[PDB]
Amino acid sequence: GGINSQFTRSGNVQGGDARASEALTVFTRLKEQAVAQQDLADDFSILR
């Protein structure tokens, strides 16, 4: 919390979620592939 802002050592550790961005990228690639193969229609959206 305020301890990090009180000392402010250079460099960043943790503070992120890495099982969401990769899933979003995978889903976007899968949607693009499905649309290319005339399997779906470009009328929906994917959000995080």
Add this chain to the structure above:
Amino acid sequence: GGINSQFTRSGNVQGGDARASEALTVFTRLKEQAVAQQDLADDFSILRFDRDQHQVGWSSLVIAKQISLNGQPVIAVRPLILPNNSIELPKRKTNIVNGMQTDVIESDIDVGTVFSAQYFNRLSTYVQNTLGKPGAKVVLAGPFPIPADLVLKDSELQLRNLLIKSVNACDDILALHSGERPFTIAGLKGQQGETLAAKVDIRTQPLHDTVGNPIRADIVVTTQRVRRNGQQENEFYETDVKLNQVAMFTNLERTPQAQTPAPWVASVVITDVRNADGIQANTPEMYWFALSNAFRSTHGHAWARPFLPMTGVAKDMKDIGALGWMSALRNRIDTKAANFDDAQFGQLMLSQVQPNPVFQIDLNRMGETAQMDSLQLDAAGGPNAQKAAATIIRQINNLGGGGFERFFDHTTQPILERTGQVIDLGNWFDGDEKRDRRDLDNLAALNAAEGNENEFWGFYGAQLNPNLHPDLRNRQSRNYDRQYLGSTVTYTGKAERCTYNAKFIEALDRYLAEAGLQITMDQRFMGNSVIGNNMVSGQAQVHSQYQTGPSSFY
């Protein structure tokens, strides 16, 4: 040597180290990736310390960051040793005598003995010459070896975390040398109506280091900030409310009394002390605040909780029934029974275990907290005994106001004591997963050897016999581990065990408690425990030859 130059056959063989260039390339790529993602700042350098052209035992990687203080350059270095399994260092020979025969003992050399004063002097001179500053001051930040048998091709995350932690340590030491505001508990009030709570935990899987090294941990004590207001929002969401963590495990030692005091005494060993993951700062005054949590484990005899049997499984390695082998009855007490429960478990602990524990620490000069372990080792005993104690007292005074003299007197009271015990550091691969070598303790050896007391006594003497030479003790300890654990043992370093002063812990706890720190946390009749306090000492008071001879003196 000169033979090759005397014949000069075409072609070259060997003559190189291949576990340094690849590591340097990996570290450069990781640094570039981290800088690209706005994770670090381009202000530090990575250099290689080749053993071939410096004539040293092991090659190393050094991370140097330099600043300017009042016009005087200052360089901070964090060397990383790189042991290799493809080459063998020459061993150390020692001689002992037995009667009329003398023999030679071939010992082994660890990583710690390699990092000597001459090694650091050569490293500092090389860094000074490379960076273009011949007279710059160089300050150490704490070595950290990279264990062997580790494939660098698929270990990118551990190396990245190690690099970030090394940069953080360099920043910490530079800031400490420059001079900043000390961390005090007076600033932890928060003035928002919150309280600090300590949670105890019992674990069965070992903790892991930043490089995957397992660490034994049975009792874990943590400190958190509880900010539960009335209509608290963010249900199921928590904002990093955690400050410290201490890993502890208990071990039993037997006092030498022939056969009312319990035969065995429980000693608690502190293995790892660390802060929260979110906190990126490491200062000396946080170490004592975190260490103060160790004494809190005795609030409800929580150190005995791992000893009680678990229901359903029995690894038979930590069984407490083996303690009955040397009891009044020869056989072992049989747990895992319908009748057995906590009703007489307390009776057993009262009748065969001392109520009070003992606190010990496994100091390591090559661990993550090397800069404090070395200081405590120096304070334990040596040429630098007064300076280390004065520094520790000054730090404790800086943490929480002052006036520590009312509770402790370092002039006529030792802080730390050295028991003359050396502990190997290694890991053995269990059938399921890799474990820690320190799982083998007195209870484990007693369980392995069911009734043969002489073998167990030999094992116990192989640890703390003052008469026997230390090399023989290390040899016996290395043989016993192979005998019991398995063939997968892999040693990685050395550690030393020390015993804290009994009054020092209580004085520190009372000083922190009086300094405005408030921490809150959490059957069959046996007899009257209070009738014995009131006892009449005296007896009722009611009214109800020596022939001599001549003496020249009088």
